[PDB]
Amino acid sequence: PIVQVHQAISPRTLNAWVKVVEEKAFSPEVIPMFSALSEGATPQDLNTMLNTVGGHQAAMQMLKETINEEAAEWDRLHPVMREPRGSDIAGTTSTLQEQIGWMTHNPPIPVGEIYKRWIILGLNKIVRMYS
Ligand SMILES: CCN1C(=O)[C@H](c2cc(O)cc(-c3cccnc3)c2)C(=O)N(c2ccccc2)c2cc(C(F)(F)F)ccc21
Ligand SMILES: O=C(O)c1ccc(-c2ccc3c(c2)nc(-c2cn[nH]c2-c2cccc(Cl)c2)n3CCCn2ccnc2)cc1
- Evaluated on CA atoms 19, 22, 27, 28, the torsion sign reads positive
* Experimental determination technique: X-ray
- Expressed in angstroms and rounded, the spacing between residue 2 Cα and the centre of ligand 1 is 25
For residue 26, the ligand closest to its alpha carbon is 1
Ligand 2 proximal residues by C-beta, below 6 Å = 78, 81, 83, 102, 105, 107-110, 113-114
Asked if residues 42 and 1 have their Cβ atoms less than 8 Å apart, the reply is yes
Map out the domains of the chain as residue ranges: 1-131
Distance between CA atoms of 52 and 1, rounded to whole angstroms?
A: 16
CATH number for the region 1-131 comes to 1.10.375.10
Tell which residue, 126, 129, 113, has the closest CA to residue 21. Answer: 126
Cis ω before 107 (30° cut-off from 0): yes
Nearest bound ligand to CA 37? 1
- Read off φ and ψ for residue 82, nearest 5 degrees: -70, 155
Residue 106 alpha carbon, nearest atom of ligand 2: 27
Calpha distance 84→104 (Å, rounded): 13
Q: What is the CA radius of gyration of the chain?
A: 15
Residue 82, CA distances (Å) to 41, 67, 93, 96, 109 in order:
20, 22, 13, 14, 11
CA distance 44 to 1: 9
| CA 31 to each of CA 83, 93, 107, 123: distance values in angstroms, whole numbers, following the listed order | 29, 26, 29, 7
User: Distance between CA atoms of 117 and 27, rounded to whole angstroms?
Assistant: 17
Query: Please, what's the b/e burial string for 89-123 (b: 16 or more CB within 10 A of its CB; e: otherwise)?
Result: bbbeebeeebbbbbbeeeeebebbebbbebbbebb
Which residue has the least CA distance to atom 6 on ligand 1? Answer: 55
Resolution in Å, one decimal, please: 1.7
**What CA–CA distances, in Å, run from 77 to 22, 53, 70, 82, 94?**
35, 31, 10, 17, 19
Count of all residues that appear for the chain in the document: 131
> Of 43, 63, 48, which is closest to residue 13 (Cα–Cα)?
48
CA 83 to chain CA centroid, Å, is 19
Give the CA count within 13 Å in the CB-facing half-sphere of 19.
5
